[PDB]
Amino acid sequence: SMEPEEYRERGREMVDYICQYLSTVRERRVTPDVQPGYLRAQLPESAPEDPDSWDSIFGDIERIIMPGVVHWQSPHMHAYYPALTSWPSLLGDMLADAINCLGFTWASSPACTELEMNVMDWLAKMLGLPEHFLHHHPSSQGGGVLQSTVSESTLIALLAARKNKILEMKTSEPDADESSLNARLVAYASDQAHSSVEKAGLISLVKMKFLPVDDNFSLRGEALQKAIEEDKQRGLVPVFVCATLGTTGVCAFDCLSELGPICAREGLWLHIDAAYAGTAFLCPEFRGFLKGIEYADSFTFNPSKWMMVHFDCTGFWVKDKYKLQQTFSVNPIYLRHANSGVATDFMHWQIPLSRRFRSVKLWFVIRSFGVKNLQAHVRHGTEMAKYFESLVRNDPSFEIPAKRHLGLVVFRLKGPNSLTENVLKEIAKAGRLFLIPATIQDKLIIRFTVTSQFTTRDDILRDWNLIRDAATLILSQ
Amino acid sequence: SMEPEEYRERGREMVDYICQYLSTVRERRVTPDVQPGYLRAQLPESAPEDPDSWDSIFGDIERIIMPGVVHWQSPHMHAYYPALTSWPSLLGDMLADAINCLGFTWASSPACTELEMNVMDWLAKMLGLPEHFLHHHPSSQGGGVLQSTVSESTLIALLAARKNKILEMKTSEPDADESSLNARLVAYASDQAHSSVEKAGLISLVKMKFLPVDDNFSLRGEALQKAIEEDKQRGLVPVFVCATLGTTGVCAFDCLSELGPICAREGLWLHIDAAYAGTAFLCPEFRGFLKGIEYADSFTFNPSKWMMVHFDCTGFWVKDKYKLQQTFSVNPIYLRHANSGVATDFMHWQIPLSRRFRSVKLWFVIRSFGVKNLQAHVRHGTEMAKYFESLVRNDPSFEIPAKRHLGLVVFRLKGPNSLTENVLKEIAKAGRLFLIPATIQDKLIIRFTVTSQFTTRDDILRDWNLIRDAATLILSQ
Numbered sequence A, B: 001s002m003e004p005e006e007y008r009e010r011g012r013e014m015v016d017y018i019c020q021y022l023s024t025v026r027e028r029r030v031t032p033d034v035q036p037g038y039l040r041a042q043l044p045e046s047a048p049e050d051p052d053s054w055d056s057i058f059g060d061i062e063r064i065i066m067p068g069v070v071h072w073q074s075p076h077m078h079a080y081y082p083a084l085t086s087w088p089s090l091l092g093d094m095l096a097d098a099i100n101c102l103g104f105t106w107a108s109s110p111a112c113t114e115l116e117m118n119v120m121d122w123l124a125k126m127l128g129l130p131e132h133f134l135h136h137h138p139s140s141q142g143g144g145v146l147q148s149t150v151s152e153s154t155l156i157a158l159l160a161a162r163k164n165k166i167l168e169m170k171t172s173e174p175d176a177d178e179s180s181l182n183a184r185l186v187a188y189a190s191d192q193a194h195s196s197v198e199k200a201g202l203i204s205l206v207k208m209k210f211l212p213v214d215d216n217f218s219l220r221g222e223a224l225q226k227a228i229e230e231d232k233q234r235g236l237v238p239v240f241v242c243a244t245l246g247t248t249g250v251c252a253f254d255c256l257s258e259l260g261p262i263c264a265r266e267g268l269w270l271h272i273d274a275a276y277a278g279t280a281f282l283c284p285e286f287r288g289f290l291k292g293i294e295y296a297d298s299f300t301f302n303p304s305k306w307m308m309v310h311f312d313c314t315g316f317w318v319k320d321k322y323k324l325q326q327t328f329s330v331n332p333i334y335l336r337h338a339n340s341g342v343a344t345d346f347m348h349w350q351i352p353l354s355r356r357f358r359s360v361k362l363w364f365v366i367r368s369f370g371v372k373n374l375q376a377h378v379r380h381g382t383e384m385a386k387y388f389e390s391l392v393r394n395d396p397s398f399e400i401p402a403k404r405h406l407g408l409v410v411f412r413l414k415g416p417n418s419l420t421e422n423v424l425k426e427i428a429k430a431g432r433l434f435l436i437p438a439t440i441q442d443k444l445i446i447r448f449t450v451t452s453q454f455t456t457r458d459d460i461l462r463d464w465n466l467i468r469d470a471a472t473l474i475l476s477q
């Protein structure tokens, strides 16, 4: 295939390609002008029997791969939430990919587990999380584990919550089947909760009810209390609440200070989904939204959104690691080792067996930037969003139907939804920026997420002017 | 703080480090002499406020990370199954990590989905899988999707199976809770099946029954037929069978030609776990074990074991993609796009939302080696294992209690299990090779897996001699 000295040469060519790509990404159309199925006719119908040349493989990056790529690292990417890479993150995974160890148990590669434990403790401290989420605190029986997505972390929390409650019910009804007991359960989240919460219910067959929110689109204690009472009247057994800090649609925050005490009193697992907004908790001035965090049984966020670690890298912390491990535990002889009892085996904290050395890139990002520069990044992204917000606020054709707390601004043209729909359609023609919509009540809104750590005021104004140009066209039609 | 030009410098340094690391990996002790908790006191208790120097970060690779690493790329790694990296795999993922796009829908990055669809079709053809697993076959309703583990692929298959059966049951019991109907289900696998099958049952609350095997440790049709009939008499509802090709313990193969017809006739989802042995099906001469594959509803194997793609990279194919989508479907406005319904959205084929561009490394590996060289690798690995087998077979103090079909040899000292246990303990002292045990019937066995694509006859002999040294010591104790 390729010799060591050729790897050295091709590695250099790839490093130089990447440097140029990330440095000039603004010049690219963010969304590609392609139709579904475009790639098939451009590739051979079968794998090559003999080696393709590296010149051909490398040449195909621009020739057939890039033409269909959405450039997520563009400052003109404003869709979804950010997913940011960075130089240190790249370098960290280069090492991990080379070692290519697996860390299902402590024994399968001690460093894979121990670096992760220590970095997850660092990161909990950086976020201002409770000490009972630390592996190494005297009062703790919890800890943080990396996962691949918030989706999976939320599912794990639900699985652990329902397994724990089922075990409790089984002590009183040992003759009852676990799946029969599961049928009694009900879980809750905001009607602004991400679709991953619904999906977790569908996968686990746990009834999931989505609760109304206030005028700030925040889930309040009164709504949860009302739901709990109504469901107990119907013979259902409340088991789990997902409270969201930084909702997908408008980046609202559920009222943890109200929801927490209810979950504690009613014995409900309280899981916090902070996928995006968790990174803001690096900055103490944004920690008002974390008030009540002491009531949480679990917490998750994505460094793979806003903290400049490339995907996959999700943080998931639990207060009670034993509850987590009673959900998943298997014990085949071929995975046993001398230190089972003392050592952390992360296979019991996750769905699959295998896991990789994701903590190298996390460690590298935190060390290379340092905390102060990560904080400065959050603050700058937020300032760029505040600038965009001001541009929109000052234009009387537009309205801003939700508050901007961080890097997401939502807005729409005054008038029927079709105007806003047509603006998005117009912008999609040139693909010079990428935006997607959401709904609040019966109003369609455009979401504008500030993404790239390199975004400047020039980038923001450029993108606003394209949006305004599209609005001017649509309003003339 | 790290600047583009500094990335270029450090990228070069990392490439050079990786070249040297992988080239000289035999020199390393494979298993580190460390105790649990070793890392904590070597690291600061908190993240650095200011950027650490890259000299310090690089320096810490050997100083901090490597002393706790199990060297999975060593030819003297013989534990578990292989997990192989390669130069092309590394280079492919470097590109993917820089672009850092997410492919939850076609629109979120078309290339991410289309390269994967086309390469999964390549791979299905390379394995000799039925055409009904191809995306781009006119009559097909199926396709391949990448996953992170076989564990998750097996879980998804069970989730899809139980969902399908529960919907069937709802036709005659429309008011029954899905979770109540789930309680009546039973799924099957060999008693040699990997622990992920058990774990999938635990996660899903589906009853799992592990069936006895023949003298070759193969699950046979008569065992499945007997279990189905007996459980139907008990009022249980058979739903799912996992047939394993290349079992963990001794690399046995279930009798798919017998199990298939039963599953088709009895309406049971048949899922094939070929985690390790799947790569062998690149070579036509090993496809005898694949007889009956036409009856499979799903199939999974790990390129991330033996095919020289670094982890994560699991192939998962299904015959009926809509059954999968029915298990998982959600429809928030913020994930809809202009081609929804016509384009492939892989979020409906998996548990989480986000997914990354894993197909680049897979494409690069397949292209850089070409099919013939991938086949040569499998054959060479098998030849090294055959050599090891002959070394053991020539020594009458040892026995080989199961047949070697591929790169795994199992063996033990004749006599009580304690002899073999004590050989393992002796070898663990120096950690110059890594071995783990399994059980067959009442006998403890040592597993010897050939791993590194660079394994030589000299490496095999070296490792055998260390094992014999241990045996000679133990046999006179």
Ligand SMILES: COC(=O)[C@H](Cc1c[nH]c[nH+]1)NCc1c(COP(=O)(O)O)cnc(C)c1O
Pocket (backbone or CB within 6 Å): A079, A080, A081, A082, A083, A148, A149, A150, A151, A152, A194, A196, A244, A246, A247, A248, A273, A274, A275, A276, A302, A304, A305, A314, A436, B102, B334, B335, B352, B353, B354, B355
């Ligand atoms: C419309 O935007 C989304 O649905 C984003 C997609 C995304 C992923 N990375 C950047 N943007 N999802 C956001 C989201 C999730 C899903 O995260 P994963 O499970 O894929 O890790 C979960 N929770 C919240 C609150 C979100 O906003």
Ligand SMILES: COC(=O)[C@H](Cc1c[nH]c[nH+]1)NCc1c(COP(=O)(O)O)cnc(C)c1O
Pocket (backbone or CB within 6 Å): A102, A334, A335, A352, A353, A354, A355, B079, B080, B081, B082, B083, B148, B149, B150, B151, B152, B194, B196, B244, B246, B247, B248, B273, B274, B275, B276, B302, B304, B305, B314
């Ligand atoms: C004792 O060794 C194992 O359990 C190996 C671990 C491993 C992973 N990569 C190389 N070796 N497991 C193998 C295995 C699995 C689990 O695969 P993942 O879910 O982690 O991807 C599943 N099925 C079979 C038949 C296996 O042998």
